[PDB]
């Protein structure tokens, strides 16, 4: 509806700032502040049969300072998943990456009970259909 509608004396005055006045003001908007945790911050563990290409894997892996996507390792060893190192994995939220070396039965077991799944033996695990019952 609007009740009279005039003259709006409002710019036969000099421009300054507090423009709007009564609901004026400079600066409302607090700062949340920048916080990087996008890509976050991936940690792992290197383990393989044979020890350098645990530490051949390390060797890259120290030199990630990439800015954006950190991955960093936290733990290296020749040797397979074994119950004690997943311990680690859960600890710094390194992930045990193991080359055809694969776990011990209870450190499997242990893995999952310790929130962390272990990957190895990344030849081909055959996920996509299974030929047998299948039409």
């Keep these: 509806n609007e009740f009279e509608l005039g003259t709006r004396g409002s710019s036969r005055v ?3 700032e507090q423009r709007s006045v009564k609901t004026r003001v ?3 908007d ?11 911050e991936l940690n792992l563990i290197v383990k393989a049969d044979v020890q350098g290409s645990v530490e051949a894997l390390v060797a890259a892996l120290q030199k990630i300072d990439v800015e954006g996507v950190r991955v960093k390792i936290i733990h290296a060893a020749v040797g397979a998943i074994t119950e004690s190192d ?3 994995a859960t600890a710094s939220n390194a992930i045990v990456i193991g080359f055809n070396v694969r776990p011990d039965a209870n450190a ?3 893995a999952e009970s310790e929130k962390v799944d272990i990957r ?3 030849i081909i695990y055959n996920v ?3 030929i047998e ?3």
């Design 128 to 130: 996509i259909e299974e």
């Design 14 to 16: 000099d421009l300054q």
């Design 26 to 28: 400079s600066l409302d």
């Design 108 to 110: 499997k077991r242990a």
């Design 30 to 40: 607090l700062f949340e502040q920048i916080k990087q945790g996008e890509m976050k």
């Design 120 to 122: 190895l033996h990344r």
């Design 86 to 88: 997943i311990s680690l």
């Design 133 to 135: 019952a299948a039409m």
